[PDB]
């Protein structure tokens, strides 16, 4: 049976990617995190202080507490039957913002702007993202030439 080590099975998971070992870049240390920010976890082997556990590598949570070097975040960890909204203290360089909220934030700013606009203009605009519809009818122009005839090649053993 397997050992229950804290870092068991993380040979390739906390290791630094190829040719980017070395000193941590400092924008990582300069990014500021409010509370309630959606934030991704990705642990990193260069700093062992404040290591997130291997259950959380690649999970996304929400900041509730910011200390002077670390943030506390609430992640959903799935254990056997239930999903636990549990809170962990991660030091600042194992963590990075998520753009998954930012795309929605751009969309809510844009559609609230085009709801402010085109209200007194009488028109009614589409705001719900309809899915990718079937392609409507269209003429394919064969400009002159015949379509090329394709037919399967005879078998030759190349090896």
């Amino acid at each position: 049976t397997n050992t229950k080590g804290k870092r068991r099975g993380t040979r390739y998971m906390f290791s630094r990617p190829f040719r980017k070992h070395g000193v941590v870049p400092l924008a990582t240390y300069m990014r500021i995190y409010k509370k309630g920010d959606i934030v991704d976890i990705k642990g990193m082997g260069t700093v062992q202080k404040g290591m997130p556990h291997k259950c959380y590598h690649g999970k996304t949570g929400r900041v509730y507490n910011v200390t002077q070097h670390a943030v506390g975040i609430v992640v959903n960890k799935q254990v056997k039957g239930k999903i636990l909204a549990k809170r962990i203290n991660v030091r600042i360089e194992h963590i990075k913002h998520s753009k998954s909220r930012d795309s929605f934030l751009k969309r809510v700013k844009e559609n609230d702007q085009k709801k402010k606009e085109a209200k007194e203009k009488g028109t009614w605009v589409q705001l719900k993202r309809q899915p990718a519809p079937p392609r409507e009818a269209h003429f394919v122009r064969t400009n002159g030439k015949e379509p090329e005839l394709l037919e399967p090649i005879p078998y030759e053993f190349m090896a």
Binding site: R19, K20, H21, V23, L26, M30, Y33, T67, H69
Partner: protein
């Protein structure tokens, strides 16, 4: 023979440093421990008083870090000391003190805190720390950035530090590495530091040279002779410089002269030019070979 160390597998597996570490200019260990504001401060700026001693002047800046770069709020150089009265000797300890005082009073003029926080008007060379007063807006506090200067005692970095502290910046320091602190008994007499702030080691060396050997005196000091600076008017000249700096520390910008747009370096050769070069080289090689045949 020998195994080629710098082979193609070496250049595949090679990893560069950072650019400023390859160029050697910055120290990322001290820079990381120096500039990173605590995360609960929530985008509060954290200021460095950067001192850099060059061979011919002294850069004194203050800066807070951002993710796209360091924003320099206020700079003060040593080559703008002839504006205030130090005509020559721009890289000594006294010029370091003067440019620290200039950076200090220039920032306080930018922030509107000149009449508040006077600091050391007359110099002493003793320990001083700007204690912030109630009711008025508080003191500006910044931390020293020395870079790669090996901070032993009597460093011109700490001369510019004392200049900024006497100008009125709440910089945390101690009088361990100002000149005067004897290492054997571990105390600090302020009068040696006052002599170094007023350049009296330079004046004593000048009197030493003009007493013992005159052509070596002209060899060592010549621009002092051309700007006719004698050792006796030295500290009075620096006091006049301090009075003029604490009087009017604003920086007026040099006006931008309009360019004539002349390029001084050879521009980047294009694809057609370099493939034409190798076509000409192959043609010239084969014709030289066939007429050498």
């Amino acid at each position: 023979f020998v195994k080629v160390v710098k082979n193609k597998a070496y250049f595949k597996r090679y990893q560069v440093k950072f650019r400023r570490r390859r160029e050697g200019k910055t120290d990322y260990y001290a820079r990381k421990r120096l500039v990173i504001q605590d995360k609960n401060k929530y985008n509060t700026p954290k200021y460095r008083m950067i001192v850099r001693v060059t061979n011919r002047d002294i850069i004194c800046q203050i800066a807070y870090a951002r993710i796209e770069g360091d924003m320099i709020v206020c700079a003060a150089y040593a080559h703008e000391l002839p504006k205030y009265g130090v005509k020559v000797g721009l890289t000594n300890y006294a010029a370091a003190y003067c440019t620290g005082l200039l950076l200090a009073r220039r920032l306080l003029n930018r922030f509107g805190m000149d009449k508040i926080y006077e600091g050391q008007v007359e110099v002493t060379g003793d320990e001083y720390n700007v204690e912030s007063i109630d009711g008025q807006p508080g003191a500006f506090t910044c931390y020293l950035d020395a870079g790669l200067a090996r901070t032993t005692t009597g460093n011109k970095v700490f001369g510019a530090l004392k200049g900024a502290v006497d100008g009125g910046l709440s910089i945390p320091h101690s009088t361990k590495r100002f000149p005067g602190y004897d290492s054997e008994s571990k105390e600090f007499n302020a009068e040696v530091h006052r002599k170094h702030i007023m350049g009296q080691n330079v004046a004593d060396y000048m009197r030493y040279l003009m007493e013992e050997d005159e052509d070596a005196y002209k060899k060592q000091f010549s621009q002092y002779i051309k700007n006719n600076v004698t050792p006796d008017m030295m500290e009075e000249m620096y006091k006049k410089a301090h009075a003029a700096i604490r009087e009017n520390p604003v920086y007026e910008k040099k006006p931008k002269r309009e360019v004539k747009k002349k390029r001084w370096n050879r521009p980047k050769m294009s694809l057609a030019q370099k493939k034409d070069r190798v076509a000409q080289k192959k043609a010239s090689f084969l014709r030289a070979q066939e007429r050498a045949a």
